């Protein structure tokens, strides 16, 4: 028969699955509802603590390339779903150890590869048929979806009350009947140091970090609300200029005449009606002058500075207000208007602004985030973030599958009888799919610390006539009814979990050699 | 003794507070299960 000359590629295949195995261990701890969270120290003298796997990975300087791919495959995941990142990062690593499993199995990778293809074909297949539609109106089965994304990071600790804070922010944010893709970028998150996670909020409206410029204005009702982005100061035009004095009246005519100019400004400020300022950054120039400041307090009018431009479109759609770039179009038609805008006083002395009520309802949303350690802030916007991901996920196909393993479970079993029925070597193929399939329950179980293998097997025997709706469960520490424990992702999670990993698995194994560059 | 008697008083903020920052350090440290050290550039 033919003969194989060279072992480099082997070799070298055998290297990348040993690294991306040894990853996905790694990574096997956190991971579902007794999810065990880990900590990177940066280099730099950063410290992050994170149950996530994407964040984790981006943490990780990786050396061996094989890795480096499967971060990124987490930031497409997370990018995509928000957690089966370590569904989909451990679901890659069982692939590629049934990979070295069928290298020493003799098998060329390209036959593989194409076996994979009907596998994956199969399962999505099987997943589309086992899910439930569910419409997105109906409020307590999203609740449920996201107290189970939730359960799984540090948040579990309030997640009673996190979740409906991203349930309604993100029904406030859609539009219900479109069934569109409703960004994120939408909602706004704020880390406030300080407070208690408890003591997270959702505002109506609109929250900016920076403080007030006036003293004396604290508290503004029936407040109506004004963003102009042309300078108060004195005038410098885009070319050079400049005043020459050579005469008398000179110097007196200069002082009271950009006091008269700063006076007409201010002025028709007021006459619009106005009593609350706010104001880009201006770096580029001269930003907000003292005097007109002198003269908006005098007036009385609530003033911020330093608006990065970046938050303009947000503050826009939100409070409902186009800027005024010039004085004439500055216009009592433009100033938006809110029931109830002031800066509140958290953090001892640090203080944060609100903006609650608006008769225009923005689309948008914001949240505060509270809470002791900075890290731990840090986490919770983040597990919050992959609620509202879940959320979207959801949206975007209404259709619902049970947690907990059982959709794997029940994914092996029907792979597994499918490669008997199917001959030739893509059915070893196929049963080491199923079989590398077989991890996340065993890994739910070993967290658990529950008998891994015992209830893996007493699993499959009961799911044999026991339908997705029974899984493992954390709560009682065996294998029920999952669904009726209320623990629900959408199909996308793991749809996507499966795609994404069959094909990076693929790429893999196309892969023969690592050359060293200049 | 009897500290109300005795004046010994504190403001009951202080403990309520107290014992929620230090709930939820003991929620972050404890949940800790690996620390992977970089060292610098």
């Known amino acids: 028969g033919a003969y194989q000359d060279r072992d480099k590629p082997a070799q070298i295949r055998f290297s990348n699955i040993s690294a991306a195995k040894a990853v996905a261990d790694a990574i096997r701890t956190s991971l579902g509802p007794k999810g065990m969270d880990k900590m990177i120290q940066d280099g730099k003298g950063d410290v992050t603590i994170t149950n996530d796997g994407a964040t984790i990975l981006k943490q990780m300087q990786v050396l061996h390339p094989a890795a480096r791919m499967l971060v990124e495959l987490s930031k497409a995941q997370d990018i995509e779903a928000g957690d089966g990142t370590t569904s989909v990062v451990i679901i890659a690593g069982s692939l590629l150890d049934s990979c070295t499993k069928l290298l020493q199995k003799g098998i060329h990778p390209t036959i593989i590869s194409e076996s994979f293809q009907k596998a994956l074909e199969k399962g999505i297949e099987i997943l589309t048929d086992m899910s439930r539609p569910v419409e997105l109106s109906d409020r307590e089965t999203l609740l449920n979806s996201a107290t189970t994304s939730l359960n799984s990071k540090v948040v579990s600790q309030y997640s009673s009350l996190l979740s409906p804070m991203s349930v309604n922010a993100v029904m406030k944010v859609i539009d219900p009947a479109t069934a569109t893709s409703v960004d994120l970028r939408d909602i706004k998150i704020v880390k406030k140091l300080g407070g208690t996670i408890d003591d997270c909020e959702l505002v109506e409206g609109l929250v900016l970090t920076q403080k007030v410029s006036n003293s004396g204005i604290t508290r503004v009702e029936k407040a109506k609300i004004g963003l102009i982005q042309f300078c108060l100061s004195a005038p410098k035009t885009d070319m050079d200029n400049q005043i020459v004095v050579s005469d008398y009246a000179q110097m007196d005519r200069v002082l009271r005449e950009e006091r008269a100019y700063i006076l007409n400004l201010v002025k028709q400020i007021k006459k619009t009606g106005c009593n609350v300022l706010l104001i880009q950054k201006s770096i580029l120039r001269d930003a907000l002058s003292d005097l007109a400041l002198h003269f908006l307090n005098k007036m009385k009018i609530m003033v911020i500075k330093d608006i990065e431009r970046e938050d303009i479109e947000f503050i826009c759609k939100t409070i409902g207000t186009k800027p005024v770039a010039h004085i004439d179009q500055f216009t009592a038609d433009m100033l938006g208007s809110a029931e109830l805008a002031e800066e509140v006083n958290l953090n001892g002395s640090g203080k944060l602004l609100k903006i609650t009520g608006c008769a225009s309802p923005g689309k948008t949303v914001t949240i505060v985030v509270r809470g002791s350690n900075k890290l731990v802030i840090e986490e919770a916007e983040r597990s919050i973030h992959d609620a509202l991901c879940v959320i979207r996920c959801l949206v975007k196909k209404r259709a619902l599958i049970a947690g907990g393993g059982a959709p794997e479970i029940e994914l092996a079993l029907r792979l597994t009888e499918y490669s008997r029925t199917l001959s030739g070597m893509e059915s070893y193929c196929v049963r080491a799919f199923a079989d590398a399939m077989e991890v996340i329950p065993s890994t739910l179980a070993e967290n658990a610390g529950l008998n891994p293998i015992s209830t893996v097997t007493e699993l499959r025997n009961r799911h044999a006539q026991g339908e997705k709706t029974a899984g493992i469960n954390v709560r009682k520490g065996g294998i029920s009814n999952i669904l009726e424990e209320l623990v629900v992702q959408p199909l996308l999670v793991s749809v996507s979990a499966l795609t994404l990993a069959t094909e990076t698995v693929r790429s893999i194994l196309k892969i023969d050699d690592v050359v060293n560059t200049r | ?41």
Do not use: C, M, Y
């Open chain 2, 1 to 41: 003794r009897d500290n109300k008697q005795a004046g010994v008083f504190e403001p009951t903020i202080v403990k309520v507070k107290s014992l929620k920052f230090a709930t939820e350090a003991a929620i972050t440290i404890l949940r800790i299960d690996d620390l992977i050290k970089l060292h610098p550039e």
